[PDB]
């Protein structure tokens, strides 16, 4: 995965739910959707649970990077929980050798 839109969020939810579990190596720094997945895994408690200030900051980044209105941002936060659930398949390529 690099950068991507909300379409790659639904693609990640598809490929995660595929069994055999195709691991989603999400490359960082490219930004936009991979930055929602990246800042999710950067501050991930357990699976799709991330905290309140980071979830409504993510609502701002879905309302700006995706321009999805706040209800649809909570919708892609529900899909954020559903995708981030398999952090063992998410592999953050945070460069910064």
């Amino acid at each position: 995965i690099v950068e991507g839109g909300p379409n790659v969020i639904s693609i990640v939810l598809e490929y995660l739910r595929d069994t055999p579990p195709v691991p989603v190596v999400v490359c960082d720094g490219s930004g936009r959707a991979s930055d929602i997945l990246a800042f999710g895994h950067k501050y991930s408690e357990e699976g799709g649970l991330i905290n309140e200030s980071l979830r409504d900051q993510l609502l701002v980044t879905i309302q700006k990077t995706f321009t999805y209105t706040r209800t649809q941002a909570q919708h892609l936060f529900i899909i954020l929980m559903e995708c981030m659930k398999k952090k063992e398949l998410i592999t953050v390529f945070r460069m910064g050798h």
Binding site: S53, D56, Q57, V60
Partner: peptide, 26 residues
């Protein structure tokens, strides 16, 4: 310079989220 400028950009990560959160608050 490597550890100190590692500190500056990683701490302005907090400042970049701070201005964006105040934008939601305004």
């Amino acid at each position: 310079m490597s550890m100190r400028l590692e500190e500056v950009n990683e701490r302005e990560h907090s400042m970049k989220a701070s201005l964006q959160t105040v934008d939601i608050r305004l």
